[PDB]
Amino acid sequence: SIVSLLGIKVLNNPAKFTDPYEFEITFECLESLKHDLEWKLTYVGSSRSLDHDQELDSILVGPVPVGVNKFVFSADPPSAELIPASELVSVTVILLSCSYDGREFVRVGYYVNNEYDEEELRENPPAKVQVDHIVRNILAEKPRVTRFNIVWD
Amino acid sequence: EVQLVESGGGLVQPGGSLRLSCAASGFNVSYYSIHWVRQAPGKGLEWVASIYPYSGSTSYADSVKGRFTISADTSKNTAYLQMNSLRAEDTAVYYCARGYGWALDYWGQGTLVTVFNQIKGPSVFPLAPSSKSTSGGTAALGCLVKDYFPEPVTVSWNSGALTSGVHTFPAVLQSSGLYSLSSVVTVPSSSLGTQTYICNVNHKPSNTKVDKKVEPK
Amino acid sequence: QMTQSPSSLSASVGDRVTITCRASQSVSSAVAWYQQKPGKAPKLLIYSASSLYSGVPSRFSGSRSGTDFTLTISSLQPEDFATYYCQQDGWSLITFGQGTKVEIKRTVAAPSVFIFPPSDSQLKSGTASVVCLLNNFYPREAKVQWKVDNALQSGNSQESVTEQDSKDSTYSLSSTLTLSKADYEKHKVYACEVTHQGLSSPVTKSFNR
Numbered sequence: 001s002i003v004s005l006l007g008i009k010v011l012n013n014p015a016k017f018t019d020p021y022e023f024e025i026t027f028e029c030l031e032s033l034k035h036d037l038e039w040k041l042t043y044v045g046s047s048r049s050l051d052h053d054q055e056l057d058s059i060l061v062g063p064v065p066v067g068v069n070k071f072v073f074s075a076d077p078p079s080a081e082l083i084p085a086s087e088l089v090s091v092t093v094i095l096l097s098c099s100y101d102g103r104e105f106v107r108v109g110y111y112v113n114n115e116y117d118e119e120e121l122r123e124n125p126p127a128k129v130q131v132d133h134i135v136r137n138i139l140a141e142k143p144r145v146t147r148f149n150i151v152w153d
Numbered sequence: 154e155v156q157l158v159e160s161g162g163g164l165v166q167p168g169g170s171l172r173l174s175c176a177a178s179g180f181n182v183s184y185y186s187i188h189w190v191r192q193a194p195g196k197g198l199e200w201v202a203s204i205y206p207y208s209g210s211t212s213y214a215d216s217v218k219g220r221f222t223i224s225a226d227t228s229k230n231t232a233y234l235q236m237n238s239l240r241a242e243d244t245a246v247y248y249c250a251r252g253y254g255w256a257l258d259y260w261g262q263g264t265l266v267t268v269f270n271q272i273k274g275p276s277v278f279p280l281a282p283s284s285k286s287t288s289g290g291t292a293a294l295g296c297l298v299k300d301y302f303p304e305p306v307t308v309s310w311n312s313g314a315l316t317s318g319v320h321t322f323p324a325v326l327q328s329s330g331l332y333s334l335s336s337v338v339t340v341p342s343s344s345l346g347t348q349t350y351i352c353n354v355n356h357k358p359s360n361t362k363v364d365k366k367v368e369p370k
Numbered sequence: 371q372m373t374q375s376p377s378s379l380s381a382s383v384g385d386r387v388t389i390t391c392r393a394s395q396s397v398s399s400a401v402a403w404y405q406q407k408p409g410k411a412p413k414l415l416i417y418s419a420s421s422l423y424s425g426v427p428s429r430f431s432g433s434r435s436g437t438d439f440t441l442t443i444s445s446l447q448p449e450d451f452a453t454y455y456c457q458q459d460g461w462s463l464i465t466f467g468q469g470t471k472v473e474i475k476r477t478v479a480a481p482s483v484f485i486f487p488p489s490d491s492q493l494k495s496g497t498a499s500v501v502c503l504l505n506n507f508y509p510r511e512a513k514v515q516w517k518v519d520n521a522l523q524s525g526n527s528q529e530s531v532t533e534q535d536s537k538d539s540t541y542s543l544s545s546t547l548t549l550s551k552a553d554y555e556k557h558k559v560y561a562c563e564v565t566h567q568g569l570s571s572p573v574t575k576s577f578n579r
Contacts, residue, residue, distance in 0.1 A: 005184070007207055046396040049436045091461060093399045109254055109399055111461050139461065141210040144399070145185065146254035146417075188464070198404075198412065198455050200464035212462060248411060255459035256402035256417035263411065280486040280501060293484040297492070297499055320505070320542045322530040334530065335544050337503055339482070 002152045003029050003037065003098070005106050006068065010140040017088070017114060017134035021056070021075040023096060029064045034153050035101035036062030041075040042095040047087035054078050056094075085129040089114050094138070100150060109144035113137045155179035155259050157249045162264030164272075164303070164358060169239050173264060175232040175249030183207070183227040186252030189234045191245035192263070194304060195323060201247070202234060216242070236266070244268045244303070267303045267358075273331060274361030275301035277354050280335060281370040284342050292345055294367050295337035296352035300329070301359070308336040309353045345369050372458045374467025380509065381446055382475045389441045391456035391467045401439045402457045403432055405450075406469075408533055412455065416441060446472070451534075473510075476539040480568030481507035485561075485575040488554065498554035500547040502562035502575065506540040513565035514545040519557045523547060 004027060011022040021041060039061070043054035057075035073096075080088060096108040116122045117135045156178040165171050175187060189201040202223035203212040211223055222235040232249060246263035280295030298306055308321045321336040336352060346369050354363040373392045381387050393401065403416040414423045416432035419439055429444040443450055451474045456467040481504035488498040504512055510531065516523040526549065532542045545562065561576035 044397075044399060046398050046434075050434065051398045091395070091397065093397060095399075107254065111397075113461070141208045142186075142205045142212070143207065144252065144255045144459070145206060190466075197469045198406075198457075198466040200457075200466060203464065212464075214463065250412075253414065253423075254417055255400050256414055256423075256457065257404075257412075258414050258423070260411040260413075276492070276495065278489040278492045278499070281489075283484045283486060285482050285484065291482065293482075293503055293505065295486065295501075295503075297489075297501065299492075299499065320532050322532060322542075322544050325528045325530050325546075327528070333499075333528075333546070335501055335503075335546070337484075337505075337542075337544075339505060 001105065001147070001149070002031050002033060003027055003064065003100060003105065005098070005108070005145070008096070008108055008140075008143065010110075010138050011072065013140055014135050014137040017080070017131050017136050018077050019136075020077055021073075021094070023073040023075070024070065025073055026068065026070045027098075028068050029066050032066055033064045033100070036060045037064055038099045038102075039073050040097045040099070041073070042097070043078045044093040044095060045083060045087045045090075046092070047084055047090060052082075054082060080129075080131050088129050088131065088134060089116070089125065100152060103148075103150040105148050105150045107146040107148075109146070111139040111142070111144075113139070155251070157251060157259055157261040159247060159249050159261045159264040162247065162266045164267045164269055165239055166270065167240055167268055169268075171236045171239065171266060173234040173236065173247055173249075173266075175234075175261065177230050177232065177251075180251070181227070182225045182230050182232055187223070187225060187232040188250045188252060188257055189221075189223060189247060190250055190257070190260075191243075191247045191266075193245045196245075199245070203252075204232065205252075239266075239268050241268050269303045269358070270330075271302065272358045273300065273302045274356050274359035275299060275306060275354060275363070277352065277363045277365045279365060279367045280337060281367065282340075282342075282345050289342045291339050292342040293337055293339050294350055295335050296354065296365050296367065297333070297335050298354055299333045300327075300331045301333075301356055301361075302331050303358060304332060306332075306334070307355045308334075310336075310338055311349070311351055312353055315350070372456055372465040372467045374456055374470055376470055377468060378471040378473060380473050380475050383446055383448060385446050387443050387446060387472065389454055389456075389470045389472075391439045391458075393437045393439060393458050395458070395460065396434070396437050398434045400459045401432075401434065402459070403430075403441045404455045404457065405452045406455065407452045415454075443472075448474075473534050474539050476508050478568045479506065479508040479538075479540055481505060481512065481543075481564060481566055481573075483562065483564050483573050483575045485577060487560065487577055487579070493551045493554070496551050498549045498551055500549070500554075500560050500562075502545040502547070502564075504543040504545075504564055504566070506535070506538065506542055507566055507568060508540050509567065510541050511567070512543060514543070515563045515565075516545070516547045517559075517561040517563065518547075518549075519559050520561075 250257035398419040
């Protein structure tokens with residue numbers, strides 16, 4: 001496996017629901033590679049009988065510098081217009097993945113909790129959800145990482 | 154090439170301690186989550202503890218919190234379970250397993266943790282041959298292996314030469330807290346009194362070794 | 371919490387079976403399925419509710435519907451008879467289901483019944499073990515009743531059952547009756563009565579003294 005994840009730091013946590021995600025990603029590339037890396041963030045909500053996902057954002061890195069690389073991936077937040085109110089204030093998941101030439105080789109999953117920023121709203125939640133008061137707390141120190149064996153070059 | 158190898162299991166008394174080791178091969182423990190999961194004899198899987206990559210953050214089952222500590226040494230590529238203040242409930246095979254996302258992909262073979270108060274070797278009594286009916290046919294015979302602690306015991310027949318028709322039952326815990334089991338075998342009734350039947354019982358924790366000849370009564 | 375049902379099921383090669391676990395949360399990423407056979411470590415089948423692990427045959431599938439997570443085996447093969455466990459990896463805790471043993475059906479097979487009196491040697495220990503053996507029968511369900519001078523016994527017996535035989539798919543069962551030496555010597559007739567689907571009528575095995 002030519003590219004490996006050496007560290008992931010969530011820079012802004014907790015944050016407002018509407019704040020972009022800021023991931024400081026450190027990875028190593030052992031050999032020169034022909035193609036691009038794609039980093040992608042996906043939202044997964046489970047409030048329905050089946051899952052409903054939101055692809056949030058993605059960026060390409062290419063060509064891949066050989067050595068140790070550090071950069072910040074700033075990913076757009078979820079669209080609350082697509083999320084039922086009960087799921088806005090529940091535990092959800094985000095998946096941070098990297099693919100090489102379209103082939104996913106690492107996935108970092110996080111639990112995310114969403115709660116109001118004031119005790120009185122937490123215990124007396126308003127009829128209409130107030131997204132401006134929702135704070136998201138990523139469980140960033142317990143990442144659930146999956147690796148996949150891929151063809152490289 | 155991926156492997157996890159557990160070690161450090163052994164016999165320990167309540168209030169005692171043990172340190173289990175999980176030697177990782179084929180991958181670096183610092184980049185994967187590592188988990189301890191235990192299984193009591195004949196019972197289900199019970200998660201014990203988890204440690205997560207990049208930060209070494211940890212999670213614990215309620216019934217071991219404050220008692221067990223999970224850690225990993227990146228330089229040695231080994232994870233550990235420090236087990237303090239052990240109790241009878243803790244007797245189990247302890248597996249180490251590698252995280253695969255929210256799941257567990259590679260599991261070791263396990264190491265056995267046996268909590269004991271007092272070691273006791275078995276008594277062995279014959280189960281005298283009994284014919285199925287008044288006609289020839291089949292007879293059953295056996296050995297009763299009684300009042301021992303802890304598990305396990307090994308039972309063979311005729312030093313391993315007799316295996317067909319043998320049933321060595323899972324041990325049951327008596328109200329005394331001591332185990333008991335029967336080992337039985339079905340044999341030709343025409344062989345009784347001419348073929349010798351000897352049950353060989355080994356209880357390693359008490360270094361008990363018993364060979365019992367089972368004859369027609 | 372992860373409530374797994376059924377605790378066991380009996381099925382034939384070629385049967386489609388489903389096993390369900392009911393979770394306390396509906397997050398799909400959190401749920402996995404494992405297979406385990408006697409004397410072996412667990413094996414990963416399904417992760418993130420519905421993703422098949424590399425190398426697992428296509429007859430295994432997983433799905434989520436709300437808080438119900440289901441493992442389906444589209445057609446059971448001989449190597450699939452095993453115990454299955456679901457797992458939920460939650461915010462704070464991992465929980466396993468209690469397990470489902472998938473056992474293989476065969477033709478009904480009557481037990482061979484034997485009774486064993488205690489040894490004179492054991493009686494010196496102050497106790498008497500009377501053992502009843504039910505050998506090589508199917509299905510597992512069986513009723514054992516002890517009678518001592520035709521008095522039905524209750525609360526003084528313990529049973530043990532073998533794992534299903536890998537070759538003939540039968541079970542064997544022991545029932546052990548325990549009396550004090552003094553109580554044993556007070557009675558003459560010891561009888562074990564067995565009721566099982568394979569027997570046209572109950573069978574009693576007994577001895578005197």
